């Protein structure tokens, strides 16, 4: 084959070349790579084709021959430094001098087509910059190579990572994803991409939630950190192997789908695209380069391989000792590689710069002294060179410019395909109508942080940097003491705060005020009851000699009426602002006159029971003592035992006026409360026994038709008492705590009204309307 014999070609101006032709210490010997690489040979053949076409043309470099010295440089820089030193050696000599500056050198090559590897391009460019040798490198992408401070003579024909990262940031901003997580490979490519994207996101308002590095083949902690934050957009600016390892681990761990913004490294790599189960990890949106392709490169490669097979030419006529023993099948897979255009355009740019430098027309090129390599730089900056009908230009920083295509993956039968859904030519323009997202419906995966917090909320700093304020609502009873607080602070426990309030509001007192409608109804009922009691009292004190009052007591009846009126009056002391004395004296003051009246009714019941259901021998002595001074002694004894019990339970059982600070929603309480069922139960034990004895001795009796039934009234009065307080107790145990005193007043008023309407009112009816029934033979 002798293919490697074509790596040199004599010419007036000869170009250099650093290609990855081969692949992989104590003594200082250069390592030797014997493994063959198809991409390097394809690129070398592409540059040879570019040079041969440029020689073929007559309007570019007329009458001048362009050569090339394609030197094999492996990925290691040690094996690549020797070709550079050979390049800078004086032509015809194997020794390179060490002069003070570049102007005294006589390099054997006009320019250099730099290495594909960027890590190698760093060293090669830093070495060539001292000699000001114009090197244009295909495939060198990271941004720092554009620094003119340390690379005054480094150009390139591929866009920097800065433009693609700017496109990605514009995409995230335009789609609204301003809360994204940025990841990069552990090599310098990922780190530089991460730094550039940090700068761009900080400038554009985009936030990085987590900035980790996926290690080259750990990922578990990086994915855990990504999943901890609620992030739905992840920028994976990593090489092929790191991205493949991350996606395989995500296959193993079943990570939730996310929108992966892809770098150009793994966007179009069949390794990641062919991963099993990869379709279950959301959309993948990347920016693929928009560059033309050599429509005639495969034909040239095939015809040159066939011509090299012929021994006649090859005899008519190392760097790549392994390049000779190859066949067409060993290089067929890489004919359609997009870096061939980059190499071709780099060679065309070198030739166009040389043509401009010599300042010649299409007819010919004037004779002059040989042009030094450092003279190309004045015409390499600002170089408009047409490559395949498309004009390209070198920026002031040696960066070529070209458009980008936003390509999103689509899945049909586990076949990922790239659809153009946007264009980036310095200003993003996306067609999001035709984008098919991965969610349940075709809706954009939302990933956004609050740039500012709504007024009345607590702000918590989120993100890697101090990025976004996670607005937090604090539940009622708490307020933001100061804007810089990280948590809402409670009030003084005696004051209420509404939901989402800047400051707290005081708690006022809400007791049973005299203006509430329930108290007004109770007051009207009290007025009616007191009026009825007064009317009955007047009727009983005027007709005092009539048989009615005399048979039904006498002065005792007026005393009981006065007692009921006093109970009605003492009802008035329940509501209002609960002064300690008032709340303390509520019960006994309402319980004493009731005790007296019930004792009078019990005396009448005892008299009736004695006359009814005991033998006359006992009756003649019991009836003559149950009425009069002994009756007065009995009622005074009942009143005095009531007083004794009342003072005993007032000194022992404490009636307290507490303020339940945490019962009502917005207001406080002033609650007058006593022992649970103990206080009023003990106070009413006496009245319960009195009413029970009266009812028991009265409710069965013989009522002769020629007489007056003096027991029905007492029976109905005790029935009203028992029924009204049996109904009262559940009302006390059920009604809201505010209306508890109102329920107590209502119970007392109903008890008094029932006793009156059962005992006194029927008597007054016949005392005032039909006075024909007040005969002593009918009553005594």
Partner 1 sequence: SDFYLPGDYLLGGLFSLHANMKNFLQVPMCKEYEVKVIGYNLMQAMRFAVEEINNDSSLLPGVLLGYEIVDVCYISNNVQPVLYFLAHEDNLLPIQEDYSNYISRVVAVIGPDNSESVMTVANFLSLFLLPQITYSAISDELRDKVRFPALLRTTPSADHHIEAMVQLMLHFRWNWIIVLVSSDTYGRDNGQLLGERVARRDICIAFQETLPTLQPNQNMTSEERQRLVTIVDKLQQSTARVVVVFSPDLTLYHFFNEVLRQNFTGAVWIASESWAIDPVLHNLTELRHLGTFLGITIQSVPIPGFSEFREWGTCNQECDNCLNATLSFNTILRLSGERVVYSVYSAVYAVAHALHSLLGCDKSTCTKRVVYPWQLLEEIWKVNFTLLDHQIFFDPQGDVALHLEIVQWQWDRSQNPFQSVASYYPLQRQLKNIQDISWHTINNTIPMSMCSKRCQSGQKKKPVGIHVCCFECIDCLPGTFLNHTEDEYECQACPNNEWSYQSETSCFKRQLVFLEWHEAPTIAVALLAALGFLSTLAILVIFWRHFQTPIVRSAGGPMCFLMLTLLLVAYMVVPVYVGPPKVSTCLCRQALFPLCFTICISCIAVRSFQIVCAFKMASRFPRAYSYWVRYQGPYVSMAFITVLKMVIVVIGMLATGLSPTTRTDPDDPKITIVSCNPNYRNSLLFNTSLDLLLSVVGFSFAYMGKELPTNYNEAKFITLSMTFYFTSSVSLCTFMSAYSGVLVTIVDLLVTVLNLLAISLGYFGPKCYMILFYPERNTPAYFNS
Ligand X SMILES: *[C@@H]1O[C@H](CO)[C@@H](O)[C@H](O)[C@H]1NC(C)=O
| Window of 50-58, 158-166, 536-544, 560-568 that interacts with ligand X by CB under 6 A | 50-58
* Residue 699 interface partner, choices partner 1, ligand X, none, CB cut-off 5-8 Å depending on type: partner 1
| Window of 98-106, 166-174, 480-488, 705-713 that interacts with ligand X by CB under 6 A | 98-106
| Interface with ligand X, residue 58, by CB under 6 A | no
Distance CA 266, CA 73 (A): 24
Of these, 30, 256, 293, 336, which contacts ligand X (CB under 6 A)? Answer: 256
| Nearest approach, Cβ of residue 661 and partner 1 (Å) | 18
User: Cα-flanking dihedrals φ and ψ of residue 404, to 5°?
Assistant: -130, 155
- DSSP letter for 508, please: P
| Nearest approach, Cβ of residue 730 and partner 1 (Å) | 5
Nearest to partner 1 of 437, 661 (CB atom): 661
* Residue 326 interface partner, choices partner 1, ligand X, none, CB cut-off 5-8 Å depending on type: ligand X
Strand ranges (E), 483-555: 489-490, 495-496, 505-506
Tokens at residue 281, please?
A: 């990890």
* Residue 227 interface partner, choices ligand X, partner 1, none, CB cut-off 5-8 Å depending on type: ligand X
- DSSP letter for 737, please: G
Q: Which of 239, 162, 47 is nearest to 399 (CA)?
A: 162
| Nearest approach, Cβ of residue 478 and partner 1 (Å) | 13
Nearest to ligand X of 333, 633 (CB atom): 333
| Interface with ligand X, residue 276, by CB under 6 A | no
* Residue 677 interface partner, choices ligand X, partner 1, none, CB cut-off 5-8 Å depending on type: partner 1
- For residue 544, the Cα-to-chain-centroid distance in whole angstroms is 86
Distance CA 560, CA 417 (A): 104
Q: Are 127 and 78 in contact (CB under 8 A)?
A: no
| Interface with ligand X, residue 470, by CB under 6 A | no
| Nearest approach, Cβ of residue 180 and ligand X (Å) | 17
| Interface with ligand X, residue 395, by CB under 6 A | no
Packed helices 555-571 and 580-613: angle between N→C axes, nearest 10 degrees = 150
| Window of 48-56, 114-122, 185-193, 597-605 that interacts with ligand X by CB under 6 A | 48-56
Distances from the Cα of 505 to the Cα of 491, 496, 501, 658, 666, angstroms: 9, 5, 9, 21, 9
* Residue 96 interface partner, choices ligand X, partner 1, none, CB cut-off 5-8 Å depending on type: partner 1
* Residue 364 interface partner, choices ligand X, partner 1, none, CB cut-off 5-8 Å depending on type: ligand X
- DSSP letter for 757, please: I
SS3 558: helix
Q: Which of residues 738-767 bind ligand X (CB under 6 A)?
A: none
Of these, 205, 311, 370, 426, which contacts ligand X (CB under 6 A)? Answer: 426
Nearest to partner 1 of 208, 549 (CB atom): 208
* Residue 36 interface partner, choices ligand X, partner 1, none, CB cut-off 5-8 Å depending on type: ligand X
Q: Is 714 left (phi over 0), alpha (psi -120 to 50) or beta?
A: alpha
| Interface with ligand X, residue 368, by CB under 6 A | no
Nearest to partner 1 of 108, 444 (CB atom): 108
Distance CA 550, CA 208 (A): 101
| Interface with ligand X, residue 280, by CB under 6 A | no
The site for ligand X, by CB under 6 A, has a size of 32
Work out the burial of residue 484: count CB atoms within 10 Å of its CB; fewer than 13 is exposed, 13-18 middle, 19 or more buried. Answer: exposed
- DSSP letter for 738, please: G
State the Cα torsion 428-434-436-439 to the nearest 10°: 80
| Interface with ligand X, residue 220, by CB under 6 A | no
Give, for 211, the enclosing helix (H) or strand (E).
strand 207-214
State the Cα torsion 118-123-126-131 to the nearest 10°: -110
User: Strands of 13-19's sheet, edge to edge?
Assistant: 8-9, 66-72, 13-19
Distance CA 200, CA 180 (A): 13
| Nearest approach, Cβ of residue 240 and ligand X (Å) | 13
SS3 608: helix
| Interface with ligand X, residue 617, by CB under 6 A | no
- DSSP letter for 146, please: G
- Spell 82-114 as b/e; 16+ CB within 10 A means b: ebbeebbbeeeeeebeeeeebeebebbbbbbbb
State the Cα torsion 304-309-315-316 to the nearest 10°: -40
Nearest to ligand X of 277, 624 (CB atom): 277
| Interface with ligand X, residue 277, by CB under 6 A | no
* Residue 126 interface partner, choices partner 1, ligand X, none, CB cut-off 5-8 Å depending on type: partner 1
Q: x-or-dash pattern for ligand X, window 311-340, by CB under 6 A?
A: -----------x--xxx--x----------
| Nearest approach, Cβ of residue 9 and ligand X (Å) | 12
Planar angle of CA 577, 579, 582, nearest 5 degrees: 105
Distance CA 95, CA 108 (A): 12
| Nearest approach, Cβ of residue 277 and ligand X (Å) | 11
Strand ranges (E), 263-344: 284-289
Q: x-or-dash pattern for ligand X, window 682-701, by CB under 6 A?
A: --------------------
* Residue 52 interface partner, choices ligand X, partner 1, none, CB cut-off 5-8 Å depending on type: ligand X
Q: Which of residues 519-578 bind ligand X (CB under 6 A)?
A: none
Tokens at residue 49, please?
A: 């084709």
* Residue 609 interface partner, choices ligand X, partner 1, none, CB cut-off 5-8 Å depending on type: none
Q: Are 383 and 394 in contact (CB under 8 A)?
A: yes
- DSSP letter for 321, please: G
Nearest to ligand X of 336, 361 (CB atom): 361
| Nearest approach, Cβ of residue 56 and partner 1 (Å) | 34
Q: Which residues contact 545 (CB under 8 A, 6 or more apart)?
A: none
Nearest to ligand X of 361, 689 (CB atom): 361
| Window of 46-54, 76-84, 148-156, 641-649 that interacts with ligand X by CB under 6 A | 46-54
Of these, 2, 9, 23, 53, which contacts ligand X (CB under 6 A)? Answer: 53
Packed helices 712-734 and 740-755: angle between N→C axes, nearest 10 degrees = 170
| Nearest approach, Cβ of residue 433 and partner 1 (Å) | 35
Nearest to ligand X of 327, 666 (CB atom): 327
| Interface with ligand X, residue 366, by CB under 6 A | yes
Q: Which residues contact 555 (CB under 8 A, 6 or more apart)?
A: none
State the Cα torsion 253-258-261-266 to the nearest 10°: 30
| Interface with ligand X, residue 36, by CB under 6 A | yes
Nearest to ligand X of 56, 676 (CB atom): 56
* Residue 502 interface partner, choices ligand X, partner 1, none, CB cut-off 5-8 Å depending on type: none
Nearest to ligand X of 380, 668 (CB atom): 380
| Nearest approach, Cβ of residue 733 and partner 1 (Å) | 4
Nearest to partner 1 of 150, 280 (CB atom): 150
| Nearest approach, Cβ of residue 389 and partner 1 (Å) | 32
Q: Please identify the residue of the shown chain whose CB is closest to the bound ligand X.
A: 361
| Interface with ligand X, residue 364, by CB under 6 A | yes
Distance CA 172, CA 262 (A): 12
Of these, 29, 34, 220, 252, which contacts ligand X (CB under 6 A)? Answer: 252
Q: Are 304 and 45 in contact (CB under 8 A)?
A: yes
Q: Which of residues 104-163 bind ligand X (CB under 6 A)?
A: none
Q: Which of residues 232-251 bind ligand X (CB under 6 A)?
A: 248-249
Distances from the Cα of 66 to the Cα of 73, 348, 354, 364, 365, angstroms: 22, 11, 10, 15, 14
- Residues lying near ligand X in the complex (CB under 6 A) are found at 36, 49, 52-53, 56, 100-101, 103, 227, 248-249, 252-253, 255-256, 322, 325-327, 330, 360-361, 363-366, 382, 423, 425-427, 429
């Amino acid at each position: 084959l002798c293919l490697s014999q074509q790596l040199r070609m004599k010419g007036d101006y000869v170009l250099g070349g650093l290609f990855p032709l081969g692949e992989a210490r104590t003594r200082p010997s250069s390592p030797v790579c014997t493994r063959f690489s198809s991409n390097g040979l394809l690129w070398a053949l592409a540059m040879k084709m570019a040079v041969e076409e440029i020689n073929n043309k007559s309007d570019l470099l007329p009458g001048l021959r362009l050569g090339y010295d394609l030197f094999d440089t492996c990925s290691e820089p040690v094996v690549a430094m020797k070709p550079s030193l050979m390049f800078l050696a004086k032509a015809g000599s194997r020794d390179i001098a060490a002069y003070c500056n570049y102007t005294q050198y006589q390099p054997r090559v006009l320019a250099v087509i730099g290495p594909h590897s960027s890590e190698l391009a760093m060293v090669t460019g830093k070495f060539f910059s001292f000699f000001l040798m114009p090197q244009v490198s295909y495939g060198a992408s990271m941004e720092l190579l554009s620094a003119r401070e340390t690379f005054p003579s480094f150009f390139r024909t591929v866009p920097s990572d800065r433009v693609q990262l700017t496109a990605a940031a514009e995409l995230l901003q335009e789609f609204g994803w301003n809360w994204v997580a940025a990841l990069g490979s552990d090599d310098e490519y990922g780190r530089q991409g991460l730094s550039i994207f940090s700068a761009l996101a900080a400038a554009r308002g985009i936030c990085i939630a987590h900035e980790g590095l996926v290690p080259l083949p750990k990922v578990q902690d990086v994915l855990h950190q990504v999943n901890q934050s609620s992030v739905q957009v992840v920028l994976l600016f990593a090489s092929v192997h790191a991205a493949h390892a991350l996606f395989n681990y995500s296959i193993s761990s079943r990570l939730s789908p996310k929108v992966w913004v892809a770098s150009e490294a793994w966007l179009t790599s069949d390794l990641v695209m062919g991963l099993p189960g990869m379709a279950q990890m959301g959309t993948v949106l990347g920016f693929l380069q928009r560059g033309a392709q050599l429509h005639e490169f495969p034909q040239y490669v095939k015809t040159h391989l066939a011509l090299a097979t012929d021994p006649a030419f090859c005899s008519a006529l190392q760097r790549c000792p392994q390049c000779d023993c190859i066949t067409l099948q060993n290089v067929s897979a890489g004919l359609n590689h997009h870096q061939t255009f980059s190499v071709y355009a780099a060679v065309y740019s070198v030739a166009q710069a040389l043509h401009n430098t010599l300042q010649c027309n299409a007819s010919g090129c004037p004779a002059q002294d040989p042009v030094k390599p450092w003279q190309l730089l004045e015409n390499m900056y600002n170089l408009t060179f047409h490559v395949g009908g498309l004009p390209l230009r070198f920026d002031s920083s040696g960066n070529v410019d070209m458009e980008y295509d936003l390509k999103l993956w689509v899945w049909q039968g586990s076949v990922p395909r790239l659809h153009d859904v946007g264009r980036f030519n310095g200003s993003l323009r996306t067609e999001r109508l035709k984008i098919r997202w991965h969610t349940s419906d075709n809706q954009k995966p939302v990933s956004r942080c609050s740039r500012q917090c709504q007024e009345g909320q607590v702000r918590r700093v989120k993100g890697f940097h101090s990025c976004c304020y996670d607005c937090v609502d604090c539940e009622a009873g708490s307020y933001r003491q100061n804007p810089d607080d990280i948590a809402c602070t409670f009030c003084g426990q005696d004051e209420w705060s509404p939901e989402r309030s800047t400051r707290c509001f005081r708690r006022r007192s809400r007791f049973l005020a005299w203006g509430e409608p329930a108290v007004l109804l109770l007051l009207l009922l009290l007025s009616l009851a007191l009026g009825l009691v007064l009317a009955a009292l007047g009727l009983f004190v005027h007709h005092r000699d009539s048989p009615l009052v005399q048979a039904s007591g006498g002065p005792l009846a007026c005393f009981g009426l006065v007692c009921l009126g006093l109970v009605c009056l003492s009802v008035l002391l329940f509501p209002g602002q609960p002064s300690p004395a008032r709340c303390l004296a509520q019960q006994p003051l309402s319980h004493l006159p009731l005790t007296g009246c019930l004792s009078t009714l019990f005396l009448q019941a005892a008299e009736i029971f004695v006359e009814s259901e005991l033998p006359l021998s006992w009756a003649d002595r019991l009836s003559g003592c149950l009425r009069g001074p002994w009756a007065w002694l009995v009622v005074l004894l009942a009143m005095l035992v009531e007083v004794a019990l009342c003072t005993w339970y007032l000194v022992a059982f404490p009636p307290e006026v507490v303020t339940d600070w945490h019962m009502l929603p917005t207001e406080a309480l002033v609650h007058c409360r006593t022992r649970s069922w103990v206080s009023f139960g003990l106070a009413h034990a006496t009245n319960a026994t009195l009413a029970f004895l009266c009812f028991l001795g009265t409710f069965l009796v013989r009522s002769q038709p020629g007489r007056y039934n003096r027991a029905r009234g007492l029976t109905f009065a005790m029935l009203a008492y028992f029924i009204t307080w049996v109904s009262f107790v559940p009302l006390l145990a059920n009604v809201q705590v505010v209306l508890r005193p109102a329920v107590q007043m209502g119970a007392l008023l109903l008890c008094v009204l029932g006793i009156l309407a059962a005992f006194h009112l029927p008597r007054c009816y016949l005392l005032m309307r039909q006075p024909g029934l007040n005969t002593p033979e009918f009553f005594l």
